[PDB]
Recover the amino acids of this structure.
């Protein structure tokens, strides 16, 4: 009957009533986690009227199905979300979707639901905070000192991505990360005794985490608060707080799988209300005393932010250059004319692999753009390493780097790298972060990559060894389907640059991005600098590389196949066939250009053949006929594989000539035309 | 100077010489693991002349980059692989590809290289062996008693998929699994101190594994053999053997990252040979005493198999029905007329979700086809559970099932489920195994799914909640790109059945498969039984559902959109437009039909519109215009989402009418035609 007890009941009943109104959703974990949510939010510093305050504590609901709990907290604290929005939980168009989405929900830092992701995002938020604090904090100027609080359940703990991120977070000694395990022994298939009998706590100790156990988290908010205080004293380890809860606490069906993922019965909701002092005839009740208590915490937090703003002003006087840099980043702006550092090439320059061109770009732009950080997973240092003049991101205690470092050694952890990148982006402060691996193993991280797209985060995959061009490692390593997969995903820019100028354009796009993740598909093998390429033209996503006013055919290609198309043009000239060449380094960027620009590249009245040593899926958007590779690769020297599959100037020319013949006597309109 | 020492040197030098000849590949782990490989193969029962003996011990090289080691063992033991093949390591077309492929390499049980996969495959081989032994063994008849030996490295231990599978294997008490960790402290990025500082042994204890540590695995083959003996005594836990080795042992560059993944220097190879008593002027040496020693072990193993064959004959007399069943399975044949159990529907039957139709199929065929086993990950029992009359696969000690059980509780572990399914298939004995999850989270397992395709394993994903039709869970759960991704992967049948008869055809294909993995995309929502569907027609992958001799347009659709197309046909009739309908439940199966059959479905001379509430990628193979969904979904009641995106009879009809108008006055040929 304290206000804290009333607040916990209010949270529980808002969540239950929201699920009831939707007749869909998950009441069990909200009921079990309401005490912990109340306790954690009371310890957190945040401003519901300024969701982007850079020194806020962050909260992540990794068990995203429990989002009726999150929405209830946001409503009670006066974020831009109301009881009327709760009544529209899981309803088309509402601000309260069935899993939380950062683009739609004020106070949702990331998009969660797919299990395992949110805890990894929390690792990334905490990594970014440590890097940010190391970059900007000074004596008497704690510009950044915030914590990252994550709730997770048994499902997240079973997903391998969370093991990857938890191993890495322990290695990185991320002491401002505090995670809470909803230890309720229930999943969809019933008891965790059926498939999840490991000693979780022993595993987390093996990663180097600190542990606090709260044996009665259904009621003991004093112990939950004390666990947070204890975690804050352990500055060199992330902490896992074991919350032993009853799923669906209070329900007639508490402690059963049936309360995990379906609405409660109406009579159950009545007895919940009566046992907690609420009116069983009323739904969506918000006692004014709860509002008052929560408002007091908001007012205190707002005074903390007000004092932070004055600290920041004083910082700008004491540290003029760092202060201006920080201000620029908080305004979301890159350094003025940063792109003048991008390398430019001419056709007289030597052939270079696009993986090496990418390394060169990074080496030039990292020193000039402090908000770029990145790393690599499952990849040789010889294929990607830190830029000269920087150091790895490591706790100084290891002697292997510092938190001010800029290069992250992710280990062999592609999926966690992907989800950590999302967390770094979510931190804010204009972070433009990247992750390197082989293109074929970006697929290991598909769960996170899709969330980069849905969350609108400007992360970048540096995805080398893009094709059969890698050679001897063979078909287990050679992408076929990978670009089609990601190009088919909404909101992914998939750059496959052909040369030096196109690689600079790809990075200009990736670093300038604010809402679109990028994948840069890069070669092992050397490619020539193209006659006709430029950053300007490649920035359009697709452009006419070789214009032929009397073209019998246009060849559209990407990456390593653009030079192949140019060589095929010469073979075709000897056969009496005049070809143009289009380079299409990013289909998404091209698609966003004006219809008239696109038609100037892919006009009516001429057959168009695509060439790319990968799946032909998607290519009919831009071509009438497609020469691709729709079978797995081979283990051998790369030039021999290209010859085997007829990706040679003569093989392209043969198919171009067949395309010209196939359209003789036919009327041909641009592939860009459509009926609707 | 014992023959064992000479054998170890022979293995090391064959591997080094193979890498040298290719000027590509990985000598370090072969040098470090040769003692362990020698010791393990001496304990293994196998027949190089019968790679499919069902009671063989299995070996899996999870650290597949080390395959020069595996190939050297296979050569020395007289598998169908020779020194001449070793000389062609990593050469186009050879039997010694840069990572091992089960389709190409005799004695390679699975395709490994992508890190983490092989250990999970080993879990599946061991799971299958336990299930198989529980099904067939009788007193005095140990039909199956074999072990599964896996080598792995630090990279596999960092990949989350291995954590998932190791947690599950410990839960399942898989005592015939013996894994060996190459504890050499080196990865591509240099020391494991940079990113991999967890206490691996403590983590494996937390999963319920037994541990043996071998402190000097560079030389102590007695201790490695003893570790195997110890592991065999622990019948209720999988064992991890920690092999402390020096990467590149013997090389001038031993103990450095540089020996992990590049050929040794020629002078280094000379000093290796001299220090081990070999001729530095000679490559690919095989001392006859080594051959003799290895031949003796082969001869003993062949006598063991000979006695197993007599045991099997005696088993067929003592247990006539089980013996005939086992014989049939070892012959690779399904029960005669098993498919008569497949449910058949008529248009008078009620509407049913294809997820429920799938459950019904499984309930009918599991009792009749003993080699079907399967399970689910990250999915409610209400969405998939064991078939009535069976029990879960669990160790009997838990009280929750038995090893004779047929339904696997994978937990929230999609990626490991995928790789474990590959291992179950690899075991053999005609296992036809399946794994259920939501379609959108098959993507979490992409690494393993691609390997199912490359390995030619007949595994099946039961992938429910296939689209925006799932409704309220929202865009984090609703597939868009998923079918395009897997259809773009070579050798994946992607069935999206529209009704009861098509769902039975999908299962007929999936269960009869011997070389092609299947994904069955199934609905949450109810769909009508179609006029014109049958198992016979749907078995062709694509078929004419509604024939219209005077068609102005043909609508091609899948799954939930076939009924939509049929409803649109009626709207179009009122607009004076005559449409036909094609159902395309599996594009791969359709593609494999004769050209004349395919043209009878998609003829020349008529515009064709595709309809599928997912990406339009791929659909131009079969259509002139495509109506799909190329943006993320929404959280709301499913019918409202379909209306929002105009996937309604009127919306389809509008686009069909626009398609007819767009082709007025044009000559139209089948989308199946091409220039080359």
């Amino acid at each position: 009957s304290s206000v804290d007890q009333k607040a916990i009941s209010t949270i529980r009943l808002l969540a239950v009533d929201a699920v009831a109104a939707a007749n869909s959703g998950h009441p069990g974990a909200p009921l079990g986690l309401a005490p912990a949510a109340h306790a954690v939010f009371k310890k957190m510093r945040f401003n519901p009227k300024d969701t982007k305050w850079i020194n806020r504590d962050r909260f992540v609901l990794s068990n995203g199905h429990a989002c009726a709990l999150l929405y209830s907290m946001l409503v009670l604290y006066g974020y831009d979300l109301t009881v009327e929005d709760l009544k529209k939980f899981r309803q088309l168009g509402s601000k309260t979707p069935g899993h939380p989405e950062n683009t739609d929900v004020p106070g949702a830092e990331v998009t969660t639901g797919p299990l395992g992701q949110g805890i990894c995002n929390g690792v990334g938020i905490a990594l970014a905070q440590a890097q940010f604090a190391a970059t900007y904090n000074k004596p008497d100027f704690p510009i950044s000192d915030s914590y990252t609080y994550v709730f997770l359940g048994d499902g997240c703990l079973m997903e391998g991505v969370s093991s990857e991120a938890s191993s890495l977070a322990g290695h990185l000694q991320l002491g401002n990360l505090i995670a809470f395990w909803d230890d309720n022994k229930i999943s969809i298939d019933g008891s965790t005794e059926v498939a999840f009998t490991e000693d979780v706590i022993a595993r987390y100790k093996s990663y180097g985490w600190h542990i606090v156990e709260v044996s009665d988290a259904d009621t003991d908010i004093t112990a939950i608060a004390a666990a947070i205080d204890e975690a804050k004293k352990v500055t060199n380890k992330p902490t896992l707080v074991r919350l032993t809860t009853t799923i669906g606490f209070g329900s007639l069906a508490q402690g059963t799988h049936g309360v995990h993922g379906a609405p409660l019965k109406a009579d159950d909701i009545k007895q919940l209300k009566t046992k907690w002092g609420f009116n069983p005839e009323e739904s969506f009740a918000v006692p004014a005393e709860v509002t008052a208590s929560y408002n007091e915490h908001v007012a205190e937090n707002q005074k903390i932010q007000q004092q932070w703003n004055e600290l920041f002003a004083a910082y700008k006087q004491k540290y003029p250059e760092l202060g201006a840099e920080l201000q620029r980043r908080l305004d979301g702006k890159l350094p003025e004319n940063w792109d003048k550092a991008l390398p430019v090439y001419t056709p007289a320059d030597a052939a270079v692999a696009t993986r090496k061109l990418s390394e060169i770009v990074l080496s030039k732009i990292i020193p000039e753009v402090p908000e770029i950080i990145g790393g690599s997973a499952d990849l040789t240092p010889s294929n990607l390493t830190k830029a000269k003049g920087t150091v790895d991101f490591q706790p100084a205690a290891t002697g292997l780097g510092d938190y001010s470092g800029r290069y992250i050694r992710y280990g062999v952890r592609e999926h966690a790298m992907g989800a950590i990148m999302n967390g770094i982006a979510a931190f804010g402060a204009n972070y433009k972060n990247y992750g390197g691996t082989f293109l074929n193993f970006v697929s290991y991280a598909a769960g996170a990559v899709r969330l980069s797209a849905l969350s609108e985060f400007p992360i970048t995959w540096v995805a080398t060894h893009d094709s059969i061009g890698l050679g001897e490692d063979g078909p287990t390593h050679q992408p076929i389907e990978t670009l089609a997969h990601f190009r088919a995903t909404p909101n992914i820019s998939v750059w496959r640059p052909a040369d030096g100028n196109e690689t600079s354009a790809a990075y200009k796009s990736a670093i300038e991005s604010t809402h679109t993740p990028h994948i840069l598909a890069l070669t092992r093998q050397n490619l020539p600098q193209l006659e006709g390429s430029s950053i300007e033209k490649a920035s359009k996503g697709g452009y006419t590389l070789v214009q032929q006013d009397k073209a019998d055919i246009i060849i559209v290609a990407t990456g390593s196949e653009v030079s192949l198309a140019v060589d095929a043009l010469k073979v075709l000239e000897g056969q009496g066939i005049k070809a143009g060449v289009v380079s299409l380094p990013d289909q998404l960027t091209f698609d966003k250009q004006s219809e008239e620009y696109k038609l100037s590249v892919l006009p009516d009245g001429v057959p168009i053949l695509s060439v790319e040593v990968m799946s032909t899926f998607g290519w009919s958007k831009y071509s009438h006929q497609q020469f691709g590779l729709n079978r797995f690769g081979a283990s051998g020297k790369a030039p021999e594989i290209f010859k085997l599959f007829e990706f040679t100037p003569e093989g392209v020319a043969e198919r171009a000539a067949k395309t010209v013949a196939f359209y003789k006597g036919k009327d041909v309109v641009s592939p860009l035309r459509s009926a609707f």
Notes: Chain A has 23 helices and 20 strands. Chain A touches chain B through 125 residues (CB under 8 Å). The longest strand of chain A covers residues 177-183. Residues 1-327 of chain A form a domain with the Rossmann fold fold (CATH 3.40.50.970).
